[PDB]
From Swiss-Prot:
Purpose of the protein: Binds with high affinity to muscular nicotinic acetylcholine receptors (nAChRs) (tested on Torpedo marmorata, Kd=0.07 nM), and with low affinity to neuronal alpha-7/CHRNA7 nAChRs (tested on chimeric alpha-7/CHRNA7, Kd=22 uM) and inhibit acetylcholine from binding to the receptor, thereby impairing neuromuscular transmission. Produces peripheral paralysis by blocking neuromuscular transmission at the postsynaptic site.
Species annotation: Laticauda semifasciata
Disulfide bonds, paired cysteine numbers: 3-24, 17-41, 43-54, 55-60
GO cellular component, one term: extracellular region
Ranges for region Loop III: 43-54
Region annotated Loop I, chain positions: 3-17
Keywords: Acetylcholine receptor inhibiting toxin, Disulfide bond, Ion channel impairing toxin, Neurotoxin, Postsynaptic neurotoxin, Secreted, Signal, Toxin
Region (Stretch between loop I and loop II): 18-23
Compartments in which it is found: Secreted
Shown stretch of the complete protein: 22 to 83 of 83
Protein name (Swiss-Prot/TrEMBL): Erabutoxin b
Principal place of residence: secreted
Length: 62
């Protein structure tokens, strides 16, 4: 139970996730500074403006 956790793809970081968590999350929104993508373990309620996707499996979230 591993996800990416790196921003708008930067250099790739990954996170072990917490035991039990079998998701991972990719969110994309944008705003004054540009467009953003966050990557983490998950799935967020994901929110006005949103942008969200969740998989189940390893390195999934991209």
């Amino acid at each position: 139970r591993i996800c990416f956790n790196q921003h708008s793809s930067q250099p790739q970081t990954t996170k072990t996730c917490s035991p039990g968590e079998s998701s991972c999350y990719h969110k994309q929104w944008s705003d004054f500074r540009g467009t953003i993508i966050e990557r983490g373990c998950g799935c967020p309620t994901v929110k006005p403006g949103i942008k969200l996707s969740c998989c189940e499996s390893e390195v999934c979230n991209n």
